[PDB]
């Protein structure tokens, strides 16, 4: 598998107040940096998501997301995720990308930092995709404790077969 170009980074929200945590920090490649969803005051609520544009290049159709958490400390990762991807010629942009569709993958992330890969359907479409990386839930301050509100991604990309 080959990575796959990433551009129109968006996000449900983003912290910049707490700490340096902008949507961008999940696509520099640079696992020492991440984008963590705002939790000063007004803060946001679950679910959280990330959208970007995927371009495989043409006749090619991406074959997986790849999700690396932050990589300092636990602090409740992600534990009930979802990915839609939609063509990219539905939209002029990630921004008004308006419906999503059914999820086209679901995963239950173990309580890790390591590096977590979401296999994708051959069904999607081929070609320029938009895609959606969503946390429904998220695992606890330990394993066993109740899930965290949050959501923190150092890294997220899709990939192709090469
Ligand atoms: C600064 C610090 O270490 N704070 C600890 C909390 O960790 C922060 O949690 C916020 C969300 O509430 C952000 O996720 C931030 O990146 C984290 O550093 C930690 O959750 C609690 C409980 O252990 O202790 C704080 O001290
Ligand atoms: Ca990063």
Redesign the pocket.
């Given at each position: 598998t080959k990575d796959v170009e990433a551009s129109d980074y968006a996000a449900s929200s983003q912290?910049t107040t707490?700490?340096h945590?902008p949507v961008g920090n999940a696509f520099d490649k640079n696992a020492n940096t991440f984008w963590?969803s705002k939790?000063s005051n007004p803060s946001a609520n679950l679910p959280h998501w990330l959208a970007f544009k995927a371009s495989p290049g043409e006749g090619n159709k991406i074959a997986a997301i790849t999700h690396l958490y932050?990589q300092d400390?636990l602090?409740?990762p992600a534990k009930n995720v979802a990915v839609y991807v939609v063509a990219a010629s539905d939209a002029n942009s990630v921004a008004d990308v308006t419906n999503w569709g059914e999820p086209v993958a679901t995963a239950e992330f173990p309580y890790t930092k390591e590096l977590q890969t979401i296999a994708l359907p051959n069904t999607i479409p081929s070609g320029d995709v938009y895609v959606k990386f969503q946390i429904n839930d998220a695992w606890g301050?330990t394993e066993t404790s109740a899930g965290?509100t949050?959501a923190?991604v150092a890294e997220l990309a899709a990939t192709a077969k090469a």
């Open positions: 912290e707490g700490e945590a963590h939790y932050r400390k602090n409740g301050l965290v949050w923190a």
